[PDB]
Design a protein around this ligand. Structure first.
Ligand SMILES: Cc1cc2nc3c(=O)[nH]c(=O)nc-3n(C[C@H](O)[C@H](O)[C@H](O)COP(=O)(O)OP(=O)(O)OC[C@H]3O[C@@H](n4cnc5c(N)ncnc54)[C@H](O)[C@@H]3O)c2cc1C
Ligand SMILES: NC(=O)c1ccc[n+]([C@@H]2O[C@@H](COP(=O)([O-])OP(=O)(O)OC[C@H]3O[C@@H](n4cnc5c(N)ncnc54)[C@H](O)[C@@H]3O)[C@H](O)[C@@H]2O)c1
Length: 272
């Protein structure tokens, strides 16, 4: 390890203290935890994520999260989370476990962090180091365009990649994002994504689709489909890699068959 990082060993659990919280909307939040010292950094390679774990209602609960903060930040790590409240959705009366546990924490409480984890690591300048599985070494490839499909919270893994690309004035990679949500109010991190579209149009393309569309809507309506893929993601080729992260039903039924129809082979599709 070159830098003073927090995640020194992936097999270890690190209890971090919650030092701040922001209410972004009725059900979305920003949670900030302190690192071991104000001079530490998290130590999360781009393309990877961490897991939070704790005991809820007598069981061990583990969940993956991709921070919105980065290794440029000293002393803290920020998570942006959607809270799934109980007795709200008729189909899931109990709500979300880790998300509600987070919402119920008091400043000063701690929770365990672990990482980094993930088969994909972006090495910058278009280079992607990928492991077929955990027991293999990574195969490196260089692309010029990265298509990105996100549904719901699957957006944070894309935002981490997007910011890494744009912060490097010498990185010429172009990112294409197709962001899908239930409704306009559910478009997580819209301000941050739009600020980035503002400052780096040449390297960042952005498009949205929502299940229920308001009357004033300039984007798409409906699940991701063939047409959206063709119109908002880069065209198939060795120079193109497609990234995905969202609900299982989205990846299995709306993305793969259509990506296949359009011509993006599975060896160029990665699912976070
Ligand atoms: C690589 C990666 C990175 C991730 N990064 C982030 C991130 O930055 N931020 C983030 O918030 N999540 C992120 N997630 C996903 C997130 O970890 C889980 O979806 C989330 O925390 C679910 O946990 P839970 O314990 O709260 O709910 P569980 O108890 O896992 O899940 C509840 C299940 O029921 C449904 N459900 C329950 N209650 C409701 C309700 N009130 N309304 C609607 N549907 C409901 C949900 O759809 C889900 O299927 C990431 C996932 C991956 C794979
Ligand atoms: N891929 C996995 O194996 C896996 C496992 C656990 C959790 N997740 C989670 O899924 C993402 C889900 O976020 P969320 O629950 O707030 O999303 P959400 O339910 O609010 O929105 C999901 C979006 O995906 C699409 N979608 C949902 N169901 C679909 C279906 N049946 N067919 C086609 N498209 C569909 C729609 O465009 C929708 O707007 C999380 O970030 C995390 O990755 C994924």
């Amino acid at each position: 390890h070159h830098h003073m990082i927090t995640l020194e060993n992936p097999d270890i659990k690190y209890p971090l203290r919650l030092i701040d919280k922001e209410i972004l909307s009725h059900d979305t939040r920003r949670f900030r935890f302190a690192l071991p010292s104000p001079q530490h950094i998290l130590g999360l390679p781009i393309g990877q994520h961490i897991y939070l774990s704790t005991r809820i209602d007598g069981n061990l609960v583990i969940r993956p999260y991709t921070p919105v903060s980065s290794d440029d930040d000293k002393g803290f790590v920020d998570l942006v989370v959607k809270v799934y409240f109980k007795e709200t959705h008729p189909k899931f009366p109990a709500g979300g476990k880790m998300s509600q546990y987070l919402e119920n924490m008091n400043i000063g409480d701690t929770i365990e962090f672990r990482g980094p984890n993930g088969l994909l690591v972006y090495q910058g300048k278009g280079k992607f180091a990928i492991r077929a599985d955990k027991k293999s070494n990574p195969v490196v490839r260089t692309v010029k365009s990265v298509g990105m499909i996100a549904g719901g919270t699957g957006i944070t893994p894309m935002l981490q990649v997007i910011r890494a690309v744009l912060k490097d004035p010498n990185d010429h990679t172009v990112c294409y994002l197709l962001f899908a949500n239930q409704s306009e109010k559910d478009i997580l991190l819209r301000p941050e994504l739009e600020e980035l579209r503002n400052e780096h149009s040449s390297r960042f393309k952005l498009w949205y689709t929502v299940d229920k569309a308001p009357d004033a809507w300039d984007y798409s309506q409906g699940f991701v489909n063939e047409e959206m893929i063709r119109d908002h993601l880069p065209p198939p080729g060795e120079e193109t890699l497609i990234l995905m992260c969202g609900p299982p039903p989205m990846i299995q039924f709306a993305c793969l068959p259509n990506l296949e129809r359009v011509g993006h082979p599975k060896e160029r599709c990665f699912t976070f």
